[PDB]
Amino acid sequence: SPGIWQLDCTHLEGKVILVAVHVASGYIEAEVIPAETGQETAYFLLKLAGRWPVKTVHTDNGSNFTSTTVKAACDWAGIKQESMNKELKKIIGQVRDQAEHLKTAVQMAVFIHNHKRKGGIGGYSAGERIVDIIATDI
């Protein structure tokens, strides 16, 4: 399960957020982009794979995955194509106040989501789960 990611889209304030969730830990990355395009997705995946060892992404059916540029990026990076963010809507809502731009609220919420300890003393954050899973794997 170490290299499996889920990628999905969300539309807010007539704008687009790509969210990737590392499935075994619930760790996320997100970015706001103007539109859900092949180019934008492919750049996103390339960033992702250069940072974590991505093996497989699960995506929705959308055209932005079928593009020639996304397939070239996947081939180049060795990625094979095949709810956790409902919390991210919520966190985006709780911090919307604290910033002018959406892209800033998005990133603040990613920070909050990844650093938040689940459970009591002895708990782990998503950020800690992902690094532990990967370290263990090696």
Residues near its own copies (CB under 8 A): 29, 42-43, 46-47, 49-53, 76-77, 98, 103-104, 107-108, 110-112, 114-115, 124, 127-128, 131-132, 134-138
Choose the stretch contacting ligand MPK; rule: CB under 6 A; options: 14-22, 29-37, 54-62, 127-135.
127-135
First to last CA, the chain: 14
If binding is defined by CB under 6 A, does position 52 make contact with ligand MPK?
A: yes
Token match 């497989």: residue? 56
Residue span binding ligand MPK (CB under 6 A) among the ranges 18-26, 64-72, 101-109, 122-130: 122-130
Spatial CA neighbour of 52 closest among 72, 88, 83, 24: 24
Calculate the dihedral angle through the C-alpha atoms of 97, 99, 100, 102, rounding to the nearest 10 degrees.
Answer: -90
CA distances from 126 to 55, 64, 111, 114 (A): 19, 28, 10, 5
CB of 117 to its own copies, least distance (A): 11
Give residues in contact with ligand MPK (CB under 6 A): 52-53, 114-115, 125, 127-128, 131, 134
